Amino acid sequence: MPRVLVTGALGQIGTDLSLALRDKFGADSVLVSDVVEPGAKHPLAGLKGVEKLDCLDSNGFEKLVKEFKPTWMYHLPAIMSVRGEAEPDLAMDINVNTTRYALELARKYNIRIFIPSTIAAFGDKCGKTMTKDDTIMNPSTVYGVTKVYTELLGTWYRQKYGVDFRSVRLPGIISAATLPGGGATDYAIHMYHSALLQKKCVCPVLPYESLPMMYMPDTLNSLVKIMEAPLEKLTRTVYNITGFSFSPSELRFSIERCTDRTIEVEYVEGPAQKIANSWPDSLDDSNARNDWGHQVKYDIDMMSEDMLRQIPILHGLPSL
Amino acid sequence: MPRVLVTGALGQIGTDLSLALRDKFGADSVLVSDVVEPGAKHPLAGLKGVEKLDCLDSNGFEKLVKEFKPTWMYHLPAIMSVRGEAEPDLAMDINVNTTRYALELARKYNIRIFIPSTIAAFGDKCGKTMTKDDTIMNPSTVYGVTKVYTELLGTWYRQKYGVDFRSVRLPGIISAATLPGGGATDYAIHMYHSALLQKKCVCPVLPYESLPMMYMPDTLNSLVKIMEAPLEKLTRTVYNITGFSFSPSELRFSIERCTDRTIEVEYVEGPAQKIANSWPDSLDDSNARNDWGHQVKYDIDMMSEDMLRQIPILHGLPSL
Ligand SMILES: NC(=O)c1ccc[n+]([C@@H]2O[C@H](COP(=O)([O-])OP(=O)(O)OC[C@H]3O[C@@H](n4cnc5c(N)ncnc54)[C@H](O)[C@@H]3O)[C@@H](O)[C@H]2O)c1
Ligand SMILES: NC(=O)c1ccc[n+]([C@@H]2O[C@H](COP(=O)([O-])OP(=O)(O)OC[C@H]3O[C@@H](n4cnc5c(N)ncnc54)[C@H](O)[C@@H]3O)[C@@H](O)[C@H]2O)c1
Numbered sequence: 019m020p021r022v023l024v025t026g027a028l029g030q031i032g033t034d035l036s037l038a039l040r041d042k043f044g045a046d047s048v049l050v051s052d053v054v055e056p057g058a059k060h061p062l063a064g065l066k067g068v069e070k071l072d073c074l075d076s077n078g079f080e081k082l083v084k085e086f087k088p089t090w091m092y093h094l095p096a097i098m099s100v101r102g103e104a105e106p107d108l109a110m111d112i113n114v115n116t117t118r119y120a121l122e123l124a125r126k127y128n129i130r131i132f133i134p135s136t137i138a139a140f141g142d143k144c145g146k147t148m149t150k151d152d153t154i155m156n157p158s159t160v161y162g163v164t165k166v167y168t169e170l171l172g173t174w175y176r177q178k179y180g181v182d183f184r185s186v187r188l189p190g191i192i193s194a195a196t197l198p199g200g201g202a203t204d205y206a207i208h209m210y211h212s213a214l215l216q217k218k219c220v221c222p223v224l225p226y227e228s229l230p231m232m233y234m235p236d237t238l239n240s241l242v243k244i245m246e247a248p249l250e251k252l253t254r255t256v257y258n259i260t261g262f263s264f265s266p267s268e269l270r271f272s273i274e275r276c277t278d279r280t281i282e283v284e285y286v287e288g289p290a291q292k293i294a295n296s297w298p299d300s301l302d303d304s305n306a307r308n309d310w311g312h313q314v315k316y317d318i319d320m321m322s323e324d325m326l327r328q329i330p331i332l333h334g335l336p337s338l
Numbered sequence: 339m340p341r342v343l344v345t346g347a348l349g350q351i352g353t354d355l356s357l358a359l360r361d362k363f364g365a366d367s368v369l370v371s372d373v374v375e376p377g378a379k380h381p382l383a384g385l386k387g388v389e390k391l392d393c394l395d396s397n398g399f400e401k402l403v404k405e406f407k408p409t410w411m412y413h414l415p416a417i418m419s420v421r422g423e424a425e426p427d428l429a430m431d432i433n434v435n436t437t438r439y440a441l442e443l444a445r446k447y448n449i450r451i452f453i454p455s456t457i458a459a460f461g462d463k464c465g466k467t468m469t470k471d472d473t474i475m476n477p478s479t480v481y482g483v484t485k486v487y488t489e490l491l492g493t494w495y496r497q498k499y500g501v502d503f504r505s506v507r508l509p510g511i512i513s514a515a516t517l518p519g520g521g522a523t524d525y526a527i528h529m530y531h532s533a534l535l536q537k538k539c540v541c542p543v544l545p546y547e548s549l550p551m552m553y554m555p556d557t558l559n560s561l562v563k564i565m566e567a568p569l570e571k572l573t574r575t576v577y578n579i580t581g582f583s584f585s586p587s588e589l590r591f592s593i594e595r596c597t598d599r600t601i602e603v604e605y606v607e608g609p610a611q612k613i614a615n616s617w618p619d620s621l622d623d624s625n626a627r628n629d630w631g632h633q634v635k636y637d638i639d640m641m642s643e644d645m646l647r648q649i650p651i652l653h654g655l656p657s658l
């Protein structure tokens with residue numbers, strides 16, 4: 019049974035992942051860290067086994083790994099697609115350096131290490147329908163560029179040192195618990211909050227711009243499952259996974275079907291649009307399905323029903 | 339006349355490039371720098387406009403740029419294929435960080451910036467025969483990884499900030515003046531030394547491992563030409579260029595025709611071999627030929643002739 023370290027643990031993925039790992043392997047077997055502390059409303063506030071770590075401090079990062087002695091690590095800090103364009107130096111610092119430190123520690127301390135990649139690693143030469151695991155990588159964002167680096171450096175650590183590096187290219191991830199951290203797909207979570215607040219949604223992504231997406235439970239299931247898999251079953255280090263593709267107008271219809279009313283959305287292009295338009299419309303994840311059993315239980319309407327219930331509960335919004 | 343800065347100038351490529359730039363544009367229009375000073379026999383010893391600069395010192399780098407006000411920069415420092423595998427920390431520090439500082443200075447000070455990439459950016463999924471400009475990039479060395487990162491980051495600077503970033507993927511470069519710095523293609527220059535010394539060459543690359551190569555004068559012609567080109571002629575930022583491909587056994591034959599004697603070569607595999615076996619056999623450089631007129635004068639025997647003539651002259655070895 020693993021000892022699991024999670025870095026960048028208090029963001030959107032880390033929040034749900036930390037809780038899932040604690041529930042599955044026990045609180046004692048999981049250490050959760052982040053450069054900031056949980057806010058008093060955060061789901062991890064008050065819990066033991068939650069520490070402060072700046073992953074840019076390699077010596078600090080090493081210290082924490084030395085005492086906890088993880089056998090697995092999920093390294094989650096990164097600056098994402100939209101925010102990276104506005105804060106590229108921070109993106110380059112975090113996405114490149116913390117990753118290098120994390121891999122070097124996985125090597126030194128024999129840790130199975132997960133570092134998520136992203137559909138943002140792709141650009142407009144990727145082949146955009148059912149994009150393959152191996153294709154041309156020409157990302158149009160610095161974030162995407164740093165993630166191509168992460169995939170390649172991770173794979174080199176595997177080849178060179180036998181570090182058990184594992185990764186998935188995550189689509190847009192939808193969840194209710196922690197608000198998203200500045201990717202091009204953040205509109206989707208915000209459209210649900212707008213609909214519950216009964217306010218105008220100003221959606222920065224164009225109405226028919228379809229993207230690969232996934233609801234958090236399927237994401238967590240796959241994050242754990244790829245890490246539990248035997249090394250010998252994995253034919254590669256980095257795997258596309260997807261849940262289902264949708265455009266904003268499809269998301270809108272879902273919400274309207276579940277709320278049984280119209281919601282108002284104005285499509286005014288923001289920076290997310292040119293970025294999203296460069297990305298795949300859908301991914302081929304057959305390698306992941308075949309090698310380690312990636313699977314998808316939610317569709318858009320099951321997601322919408324769950325989001326519409328969970329947001330009022332977790333954030334105190336009005337409900338249906 | 340451009341004002342040209344060359345960083346990492348005392349190495350194999352920098353040595354001849356610095357001399358060619360000084361001849362073409364005038365010594366007063368060219369400033370070159372390196373982390374070390376030239377030795378008394380270095381061809382740039384004793385010359386004006388040769389400075390000591392560590393490109394990891396971003397302050398120092400910026401001070402030199404600000405004083406000189408280059409309009410062009412050739413940013414050459416990197417730790418190469420073989421040496422990188424043995425010193426990967428240095429490779430990551432140099433190849434990533436000096437490149438980031440270079441691109442930022444090109445943005446900040448309006449410099450057309452050349453940073454070479456390499457055939458080592460490719461690995462074994464590239465399509466090994468006549469490799470295309472756009473293909474799967476899966477390098478198996480940390481050096482190659484850092485160069486994919488260099489191509490993509492430079493390209494992003496071009497898109498995001500209008501930075502005029504230009505690159506070629508260089509094949510193995512052959513020259514006589516300054517000895518090579520630890521690439522997988524270094525055997526070739528050393529075989530010419532062995533021949534003139536009439537000493538046994540122990541060759542770490544296997545006899546039929548064919549690689550893209552180019553002789554220096556063609557390389558210099560292309561390095562200036564791609565930089566003279568008008569921006570609007572360039573359909574891309576990164577170009578394959580090649581001279582011709584050869585294996586060690588072909589090189590040996592070529593040296594033997596020119597010397598009219600047997601060289602003794604023993605094949606004892608070293609790290610260079612596995613590295614080189616993941617690379618293309620040959621490149622497609624049509625985009626370069628078409629966009630900016632990349633062209634090649636030498637073939638293997640002209641190269642060998644010129645190498646065997648110049649090495650005695652340049653290094654005091656025994657002639658023919
Ligand atoms: N959410 C998505 O839809 C999505 C999609 C594809 C990939 N990803 C990837 O998943 C990972 C996490 O994404 P997220 O949505 O949870 O992001 P987020 O922005 O919600 O969370 C990032 C967390 O990292 C922390 N962090 C920042 N700098 C740090 C440092 N120096 N040291 C330690 N922690 C630091 C932040 O405080 C924050 O809690 C990233 O690698 C991201 O690229 C996310
Ligand atoms: N020679 C080849 O066959 C070849 C092939 C493909 C690509 N390249 C690329 O061409 C460039 C130059 O290659 P080269 O063969 O001349 O390399 P080299 O090792 O011969 O020379 C590199 C020079 O850079 C200097 N340097 C190292 N660290 C530095 C620092 N921190 N600051 C300033 N200078 C520093 C070294 O002192 C040396 O003079 C590199 O980017 C390399 O990857 C070379």
Ligand code: NA
Pocket residue numbers: 227228229294295297298299
């Ligand atoms: Na799309």
Ligand code: NA
Pocket residue numbers: 547548549614615617618619
């Ligand atoms: Na070859």
